[PDB]
Amino acid sequence: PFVNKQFNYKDPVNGVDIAYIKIPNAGQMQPVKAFKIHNKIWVIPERDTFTNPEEGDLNPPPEAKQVPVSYYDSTYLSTDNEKDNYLKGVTKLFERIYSTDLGRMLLTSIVRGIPFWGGSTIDTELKVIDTNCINVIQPDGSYRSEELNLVIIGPSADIIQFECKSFGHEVLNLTRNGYGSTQYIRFSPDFTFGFEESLEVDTNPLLGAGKFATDPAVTLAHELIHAGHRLYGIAINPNRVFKVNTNAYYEMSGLEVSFEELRTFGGHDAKFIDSLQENEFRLYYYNKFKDIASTLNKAKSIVGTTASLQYMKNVFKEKYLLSEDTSGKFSVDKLKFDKLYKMLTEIYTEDNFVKFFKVLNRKTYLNFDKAVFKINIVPKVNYTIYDGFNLRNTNLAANFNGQNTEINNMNFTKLKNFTGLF
């Protein structure tokens, strides 16, 4: 299993994989109980009022000031039972993802995707960037710095605003300069979205109540794909967008969708990014990887005593699949770069995960959500690692009946409808 331990929220802290920690948000915060579910991956069963100082409260703005697709409940994830279920739910989704070859490939890439040690201002020394770490309270009450790649945390004010958040640098664009940075994914396994089976209905903002429920494993996979791009520092600048001209409802409102999102969804959506810009990006990131190789070659000493320079150089050699010649020099091989870049951007996509999970899902990112449902995937009678909602040897096994909110209505409680509110 991906998660060797089936943690209980109330399990006693041990200062190793169950501990109170603080994150480098440049601000003050009380320690929060966190769980290390796998090498380099932690889960914090708390609403995220930490990564953004301006989002330190679950207080919702005005009463009509926010987007149609949003859901607020300041009380969500405030009790121990909720946090216990949140932990078990997130764990279950990681196992579901890991049970597929594609998921195993993606999670392996994420674990190997250690944020680059580019914190040194002296080119002859290799140093870590502290915002790619968390401070763990040890048994003696003292703090120890631990590098990590991923943190799954509860959502902020808007419960359904799932996204990757990461701490920036004063001058370096860590998610786009090849370096990478620790990713904090705001996510909840306790809610899901409703979509429509018909493409012309699903992509219309005035039609559909949301008959089918999105499998949350796909939703989490979507964020993990973004996390992968960001951990390898190859995320596409959000300023690069597709001026949607394939949906009149998007067009008439001048809606623009980032290439990063189209890439992440994959399938036909990825084709909206033309060859010219696609090649520009590839070359751009190829150069970024070359800089990493050059930086590694200049480093003659390592800062700290957590690892040897030799070990860290090998760590990044493996991460970026660099070539190490006779002179021990590192360089970027075009073929290896294209292979890794393509793996991270074309193999790991939402559309491909849908094929692996064998679930019904939106056919494009360019649609309109219909509703949001409260769900509970922890009970095996409701959802399993292997079949999601479509439980084998039951009436829910075929035709995605488990995802059919009308047939499997006991597994979904509609909280809000979005149709007509766009």
Binding site: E163, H226, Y365, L366
Partner: peptide, 4 residues
């Protein structure tokens, strides 16, 4: 992130 999702859009619409």
């Amino acid at each position: 992130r999702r859009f619409c």
